[PDB]
Amino acid sequence: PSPFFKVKKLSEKAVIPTRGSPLSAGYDLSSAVDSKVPARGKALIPTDLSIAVPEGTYARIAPRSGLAWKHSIDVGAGVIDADYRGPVGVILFNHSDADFEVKFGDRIAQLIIEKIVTPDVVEVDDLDETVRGDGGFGSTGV
Amino acid sequence: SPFFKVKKLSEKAVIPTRGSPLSAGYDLSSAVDSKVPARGKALIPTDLSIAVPEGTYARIAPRSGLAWKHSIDVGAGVIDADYRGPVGVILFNHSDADFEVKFGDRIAQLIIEKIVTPDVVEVDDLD
Amino acid sequence: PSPFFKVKKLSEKAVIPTRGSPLSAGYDLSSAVDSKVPARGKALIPTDLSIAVPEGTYARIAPRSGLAWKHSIDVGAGVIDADYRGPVGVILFNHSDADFEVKFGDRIAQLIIEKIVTPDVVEVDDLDETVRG
Ligand SMILES: O=c1ccn([C@H]2C[C@H](O)[C@@H](COP(=O)(O)NP(=O)(O)OP(=O)(O)O)O2)c(=O)[nH]1
Ligand SMILES: O=c1ccn([C@H]2C[C@H](O)[C@@H](COP(=O)(O)NP(=O)(O)OP(=O)(O)O)O2)c(=O)[nH]1
Ligand SMILES: O=c1ccn([C@H]2C[C@H](O)[C@@H](COP(=O)(O)NP(=O)(O)OP(=O)(O)O)O2)c(=O)[nH]1
Ligand SMILES: [Mg+2]
Ligand SMILES: [Mg+2]
Ligand SMILES: [Mg+2]
């Protein structure tokens, strides 16, 4: 079917998520509360939204660039399942030594509806061999 | 058809399971006890090797409970479709509280993300 | 429509992104500068690239595992819109007590062209119910 993104407001403070540029990846999420993210700490910021996205996708809470370089803010967790109908919370980590203030309505993250596959796991005794093989953790160099 | 092939590397390994019916992720279990030091990191073995299809990769993604309760985040996390080595999970501990992972704990979730991998075309103008 | 990944060098310090293995998810990104990511701090590292990827995708700047494990480096931000035509910057956090040196040409992140959907958002009074838990 056609993809969709449906949102239900859980309070008046909720804000409809907002696209950026026309080919933009995400929908900006706004805080439904006044809060803060403590220096070198974390916070759970409610959006007061419940959402629905299609089977074969999930909604990823992803970081905004401005907040990253200006405030050292990153998004923790962030995997919203397509069948999750509870309140959507944004987990922020503050990797700086100053508290980050959040006012209600402030755009604190961006939601991206990522395409995925979910096949049944097939357990095998052997896998195919490749060029990469067991190479990882810097095997291709600096 | 998409696939997710999993090879157990030891009897400590657990076949990943999805936590809910339409869930994005297959939960990954730790094959060891391990300390994740405050403001530090740990590399946790799953004792699994995997294969996913060309046109996808396996992303090691953070679980919400570990993040919210324990300030745990997943570093790195890009498992290439051609990687046949052991899948390892990098955890960062973004708190001043030392934390301990126990054998069998679900410490991350694997998501098989759809991607494209075209050959790069260099241009002087992008549109 | 066939996917593409168009790249424009903004300087001679830019490097065309390359796949680290034949079926790699990502294209490695090189620093166009000598810089550093301070201990417990951050840096924006220019690539001197502008890029374009298709509608229905975005370019994700993602962390390399070697740098993550050896140097506690992680990638912040990282969402490059398919219609973004400015310079592509890599935002790095350093989660260790040791400064991390960046030399020009060092591969400091990887770019993954992730498939997405971008439907028009709609507010509803009631969502469809699901059996969860
Ligand atoms: O950042 C987040 C992450 C998750 N969530 C919600 C939606 C998601 O479908 C649901 C479960 O998230 P995780 O699977 O990542 N957390 P965990 O595995 O610890 O809990 P559970 O056992 O319920 O799956 O929590 C948020 O609201 N914000
Ligand atoms: O979290 C991770 C990340 C990577 N890996 C493995 C699988 C992956 O295909 C391989 C290489 O990952 P990256 O390309 O993201 N890191 P890096 O570029 O430093 O390693 P390499 O030079 O080998 O490509 O390491 C893990 O086991 N866990
Ligand atoms: O890591 C990044 C992230 C973004 N960017 C560029 C490309 C992206 O399309 C553009 C905007 O990214 P964000 O939406 O994450 N930033 P923000 O929401 O703060 O600002 P804007 O008003 O431009 O959307 O900045 C980078 O170069 N590196
Ligand atoms: Mg934006
Ligand atoms: Mg879960
Ligand atoms: Mg690599």
3-state secondary structure of C69: helix
**CA A25 to CA C55: how far, in whole Å?**
9
In the structure encoding, which two tokens stand for residue A5, read together?
A: 């993104």
**CA B30 to CA B49: how far, in whole Å?**
14
Interface test with C, best of B34, B110, B113, B116 (most C CBs within 10 A): B116
Evaluate whether B29 touches A87 at the Cβ level (below 8 Å).
no
Q: Which residues contact A102 (CB under 8 A, 6 or more apart)?
A: A31, A33, A34, A35, A36, A37, A43, A45, A108
3-state secondary structure of A117: strand
Rounded to 10 degrees, the C-alpha dihedral B61/A86/A109/A92 comes to -70
**CA A10 to CA C44: how far, in whole Å?**
37
Q: Solved how? A: X-ray
> In Å, how far are B86, B112, C26, C82, C103 from C114, measured between CA atoms?
24, 11, 10, 10, 28
Evaluate whether A3 touches A113 at the Cβ level (below 8 Å).
yes
For ligand 2, mutation pick of A131, A137, A139 (most atoms within 8 Å of CB): A137
- Who among B78, B90, B122 is closest to C112 (CB)? B78
Q: Beta-strand (E) ranges in A84-129?
A: 89-94, 100-102, 107-117, 121-123
In the structure encoding, which two tokens stand for residue A11, read together?
A: 């309070």
Position B24, amino acid = A
Give the position, in ligand 3's atom list, of the atom nearest the Cα of A20: 24
Ligand in nearest proximity to the CA of C46: 3
How far C115 CA sits from the closest chain A CA (Å)? 6
3-state secondary structure of C73: strand
SS3 content of chain B, % helix, strand, coil (to 5): 5, 45, 50
| Cross-strand pairs, B47 | none
| Domains of chain B, start order | 1-127 (2.70.40.10)
Cα angle, residue B111 at apex, residues B90 and A92 outer, rounded to 5°: 60
How far C34 CA sits from the closest chain B CA (Å)? 23
Rg of chain A in Å (alpha carbons):
18
Q: Please indicate whether, in this complex, the C-beta atoms of B115 and C113 are within 8 angstroms of each other.
A: yes
**CA B1 to CA B54: how far, in whole Å?**
11
